[PDB]
Amino acid sequence: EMLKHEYVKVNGIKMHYVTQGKGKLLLLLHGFPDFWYVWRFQIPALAKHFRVVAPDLRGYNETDKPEGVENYRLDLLAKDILGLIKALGEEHAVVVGHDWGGIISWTLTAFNPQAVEKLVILNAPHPKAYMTRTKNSLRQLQKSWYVFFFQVANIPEKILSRNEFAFLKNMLIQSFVRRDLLTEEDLRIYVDAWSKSGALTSALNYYRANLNPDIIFSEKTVVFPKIKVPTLVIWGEKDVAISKDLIVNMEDFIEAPYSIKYFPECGHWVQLEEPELVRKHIEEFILKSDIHHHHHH
Amino acid sequence: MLKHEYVKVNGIKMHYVTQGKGKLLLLLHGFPDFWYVWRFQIPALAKHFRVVAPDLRGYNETDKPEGVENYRLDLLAKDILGLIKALGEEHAVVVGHDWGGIISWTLTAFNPQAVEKLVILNAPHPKAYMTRTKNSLRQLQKSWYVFFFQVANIPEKILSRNEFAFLKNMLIQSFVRRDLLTEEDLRIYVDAWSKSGALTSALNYYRANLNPDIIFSEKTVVFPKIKVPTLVIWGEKDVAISKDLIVNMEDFIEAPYSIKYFPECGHWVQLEEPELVRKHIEEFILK
Numbered sequence: 001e002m003l004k005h006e007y008v009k010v011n012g013i014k015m016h017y018v019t020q021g022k023g024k025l026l027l028l029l030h031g032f033p034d035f036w037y038v039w040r041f042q043i044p045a046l047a048k049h050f051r052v053v054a055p056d057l058r059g060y061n062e063t064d065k066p067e068g069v070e071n072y073r074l075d076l077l078a079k080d081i082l083g084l085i086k087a088l089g090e091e092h093a094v095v096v097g098h099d100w101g102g103i104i105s106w107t108l109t110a111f112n113p114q115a116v117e118k119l120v121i122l123n124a125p126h127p128k129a130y131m132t133r134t135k136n137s138l139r140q141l142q143k144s145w146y147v148f149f150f151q152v153a154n155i156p157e158k159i160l161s162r163n164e165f166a167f168l169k170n171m172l173i174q175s176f177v178r179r180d181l182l183t184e185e186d187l188r189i190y191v192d193a194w195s196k197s198g199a200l201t202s203a204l205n206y207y208r209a210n211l212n213p214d215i216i217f218s219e220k221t222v223v224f225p226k227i228k229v230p231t232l233v234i235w236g237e238k239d240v241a242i243s244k245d246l247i248v249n250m251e252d253f254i255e256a257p258y259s260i261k262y263f264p265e266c267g268h269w270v271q272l273e274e275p276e277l278v279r280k281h282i283e284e285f286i287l288k289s290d291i292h293h294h295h296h297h
Numbered sequence: 298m299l300k301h302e303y304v305k306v307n308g309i310k311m312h313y314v315t316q317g318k319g320k321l322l323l324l325l326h327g328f329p330d331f332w333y334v335w336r337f338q339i340p341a342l343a344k345h346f347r348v349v350a351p352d353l354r355g356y357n358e359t360d361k362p363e364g365v366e367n368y369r370l371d372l373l374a375k376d377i378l379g380l381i382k383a384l385g386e387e388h389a390v391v392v393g394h395d396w397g398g399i400i401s402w403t404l405t406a407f408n409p410q411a412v413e414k415l416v417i418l419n420a421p422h423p424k425a426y427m428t429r430t431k432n433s434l435r436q437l438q439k440s441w442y443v444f445f446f447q448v449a450n451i452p453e454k455i456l457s458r459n460e461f462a463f464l465k466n467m468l469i470q471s472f473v474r475r476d477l478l479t480e481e482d483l484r485i486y487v488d489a490w491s492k493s494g495a496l497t498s499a500l501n502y503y504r505a506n507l508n509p510d511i512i513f514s515e516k517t518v519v520f521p522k523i524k525v526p527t528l529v530i531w532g533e534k535d536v537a538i539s540k541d542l543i544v545n546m547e548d549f550i551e552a553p554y555s556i557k558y559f560p561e562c563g564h565w566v567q568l569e570e571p572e573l574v575r576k577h578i579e580e581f582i583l584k
């Protein structure tokens with residue numbers, strides 16, 4: 001059965017996703033400035049075993065793009081995924097998230113553990129670690145320069161988009177470990193998703209709603225339940241956007257089986273750089289029995 | 298005796314301190330400093346020169362016009378041009394750190410008749426900044442706070458609350474040694490930061506001159522070549538400025554140029570190697 005495109009109403013918006021395979025629901029959630037297509041190396045391999053669903057998140061590509069910054073608050077983003085699980089006819093999913101998708105995945109898992117059977121994170125800090133540590137970390141504040149850039153209304157969208165997205169392409173390419181990670185053909189495909197009307201504003205609204213300076217430098221402390229479901233973290237260490245300072249003691253946030261696979265020579269997009277090892281680690285993690293009553297048989 | 302003075306320039310009243318007689322030597326501070334950043338150099342240089350260290354527009358005891366467009370670089374440069382004239386002079390030796398240095402590059406480029414010699418501490422040439430930053434991940438990262446400062450009200454609140462806790466902390470994290478300022482120094486700094494209007498005026502420099510439309514412009518900035526002898530002093534461990542912005546200055550200067558690197562110093566080289574900085578300045582002027 002091939003890859004198919006589908007559209008479903010969730011949490012008041014119409015969400016586009018692609019799906020391939022049958023079996024356990026395995027959600028793959030992209031981040032900025034990607035869309036479902038970031039998972040193109042994992043979808044067919046994982047679809048050999050699982051029902052893979054890769055949505056475009058609120059605001060992105062073919063998904064609806066509500067107006068207004070407060071329509072991009074993280075609680076709504078997580079509810080979109082909760083609603084997607086239900087709309088797919090399911091009650092539980094294995095949830096894999098990269099970048100913003102990882103932020104949403106940590107959140108959904110912490111606040112809605114009933115919906116998440118197992119959690120996989122690629123290169124997204126735990127939200128509490130980001131909120132606690134960034135204000136005190138010059139290294140992270142530097143790496144988060146673009147978060148502050150994106151807070152200004154109107155102007156960042158125009159800058160990123162001018163000259164057929166020259167700055168967005170350049171800023172994206174400079175975030176990679178090797179400059180040639182995406183082909184020109186990949187870049188054409190990305191420009192098509194970036195050009196959907198309203199998409200770029202909606203994507204930057206995630207930073208305006210959730211990472212504005214009042215939040216970053218808040219004196220309030222964020223209450224975040226411990227993660228209570230098995231968790232796999234895949235981490236490219238050469239990540240331009242996230243300091244290793246933010247993943248120190250990351251296992252403290254987890255009260256369940258936890259494994260981390262470090263990729264010392266990979267950056268923020270390990271799924272594009274070591275696709276086969278990513279696929280393998282995810283599959284082994286999902287298929288591992290949680291009950292071990294036949295050692296060495 | 299170090300003396301405080303006020304003088305009208307370019308429609309504003311400017312405060313400055315002065316000591317000594319002879320050749321006019323201007324020392325121009327940047328953010329988040331004021332004349333007092335020059336405390337180690339003023340007495341030594343005053344032995345041979347007429348040292349004047351002003352508070353720039355918006356800072357400490359100088360006037361603080363309201364409105365972002367009152368902080369455009371051309372107005373800041375005209376303030377210094379006006380100061381030279383108000384001091385009874387037609388030219389000065391001009392030493393600038395940080396924003397002081399940006400203004401000094403600008404004054405020197407557009408008004409060479411007003412500048413005998415130019416000294417820059419840790420300030421990139423403006424055209425180098427404008428050309429390079431938009432394409433430099435390293436510089437964009439170091440420039441995070443430039444973008445933070447674009448937002449109205451919130452940066453002032455964050456920097457100032459709890460008696461400037463964040464500004465002190467971020468300032469201290471920018472030093473080579475965490476003990477560079479004494480408690481006494483910090484009290485003096487807080488007093489200047491707390492002048493009515495001072496913090497908003499200082500951040501207005503970034504809003505007027507370093508907003509994203511300027512940084513990411515593809516227009517070329519027209520900037521005459523520097524035509525007077527120039528010494529650049531550069532602390533290499535600068536948290537705010539990539540070394541990528543000071544290399545390869547040949548396009549920008551058509552006069553004698555020398556650069557002195559301080560490998561073990563950061564942005565505040567005049568505080569970290571006070572004696573060597575003073576020595577290089579003196580030797581350069583007296584040659």
Ligand SMILES: C=C(C)[C@@H]1CC[C@](C)(O)[C@@H](Cl)C1
Pocket residue numbers: 031098099100102103123124125127130210211241242
């Ligand atoms: C929302 C966040 C705390 C994070 C910040 C860092 C990145 C890289 O922009 C992505 Cl993971 C989103």
Ligand SMILES: C=C(C)[C@@H]1CC[C@](C)(O)[C@@H](Cl)C1
Pocket residue numbers: 032033099146168171172175240241268
């Ligand atoms: C457009 C940008 C400034 C980049 C794009 C890639 C990331 C991972 O989202 C962060 Cl580094 C921001």
Ligand SMILES: C=C(C)[C@@H]1CC[C@](C)(O)[C@@H](Cl)C1
Pocket residue numbers: 327394395396398399419420421423426506507537538
């Ligand atoms: C181009 C500018 C206006 C510069 C940029 C770097 C600094 C450190 O913030 C000061 Cl030197 C101002």
Ligand SMILES: C=C(C)[C@@H]1CC[C@](C)(O)[C@@H](Cl)C1
Pocket residue numbers: 328329442464467468471536537564
């Ligand atoms: C207040 C800040 C966030 C910092 C500290 C002072 C500097 C050197 O001007 C740059 Cl690092 C901005």
Ligand SMILES: [Cl-]
Pocket residue numbers: 003004005006
């Ligand atoms: Cl289809």
Ligand SMILES: [Cl-]
Pocket residue numbers: 248249250251252
């Ligand atoms: Cl850990």
Ligand SMILES: [Cl-]
Pocket residue numbers: 262263264265266
């Ligand atoms: Cl690796």
Ligand SMILES: [Cl-]
Pocket residue numbers: 290291292293
């Ligand atoms: Cl068991």
Ligand SMILES: [Cl-]
Pocket residue numbers: 357358
């Ligand atoms: Cl004073």
Ligand code: NA
Pocket residue numbers: 136137138139140243245
């Ligand atoms: Na840190």
Ligand code: NA
Pocket residue numbers: 432433434435436539541
């Ligand atoms: Na660079």
